[PDB]
Amino acid sequence: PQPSRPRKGSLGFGPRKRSTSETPRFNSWPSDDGQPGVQGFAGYKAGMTHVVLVNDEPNSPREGMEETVPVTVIETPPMRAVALRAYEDTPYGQRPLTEVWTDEFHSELDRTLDVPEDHDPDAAEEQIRDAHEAGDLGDLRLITHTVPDAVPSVPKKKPDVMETRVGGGSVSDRLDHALDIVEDGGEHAMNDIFRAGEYADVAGVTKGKGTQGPVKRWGVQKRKGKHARQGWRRRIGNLGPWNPSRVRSTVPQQGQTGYHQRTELNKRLIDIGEGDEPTVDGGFVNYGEVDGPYTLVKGSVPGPDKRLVRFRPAVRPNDQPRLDPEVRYVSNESNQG
């Protein structure tokens, strides 16, 4: 009687095309609660290893016991908050009002931007403060970029630029908090935003697989038994009924698979350190050696090694934070073998 069965693959990540920016772009930010603060950071994926942790969960029968947990190692060197952009609220939504830039720029920020030579930081600030007085000011975001040069395993020297919202406290206070950061030189670290044990949402552009068929791309069955030997092995039964006389965009077909932006929720940060404690013998395969600021994310992160991954305080955590998990072991065993 034709049994029921959910469809093949989700219709919520379409169209399944090649991403426009290899650098991830968050389409949502955490709410305003605590003191002002930058709501995100970024790093470069190195590879994976595992760690033995002391069970944290107070509701877990294993609380206080050894537990092996998979971890992805991400190099998270300091970034530069190079400017402060203000948004005004208009009948058509939020729109960039102006920006407040600095003077101190990383030696190679000019591999991507036409660095400012003449700018008026106060005129900009002025216009912004008046916007607030008038009550037309929309959220406040910092223009941020990475410092690839600090990461040897990554060939790239050209910085990756991304806008990151600043939330928390009162607008007046976080506005001043924003200008503070920027003016310095914008240099901030993973430490200034996250603490081991908190939940972060990680975004990244998945590994590319080029063109793939429906079986792999949508998870449709392969033809079965006798139907697998007639000339069709990995092709779906049909493109649709006689009527409607057209092919719906919902039937699973071949096409670009991979190299899509994905935002993975609730990734627990196991540890934020610096040095080479997590590096692996022989070096992370197809990457290199880690010896600098790093972050250990519980589980997996989208993208291949070397890709830029972005962190943001979890916007929909399911669990309360259990700060600074106790780590009793970090495997340094060769990943070749």
């Binding site: 595992h50 033995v52 092996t68 072991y329 495997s331 065993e333």
Partner: protein
């Protein structure tokens, strides 16, 4: 823990434990060791093994 076959230390968070029919237990550090053991080879007779060395 030590691999009950070759003698090397088993990297924590790794390996497999084979439970024999009589209830005995054999901690293996890798498929290679399990596979040689399945061939009926004895660790002492295999030079690359710590047991042998």
């Amino acid at each position: 823990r030590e691999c009950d076959y070759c003698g090397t230390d088993i990297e924590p968070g790794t390996g497999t434990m084979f439970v024999h029919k009589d209830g005995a237990t054999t901690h293996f550090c890798s498929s290679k060791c399990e596979n040689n053991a399945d061939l009926g080879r004895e660790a002492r007779n295999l030079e690359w093994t710590d047991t042998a060395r």
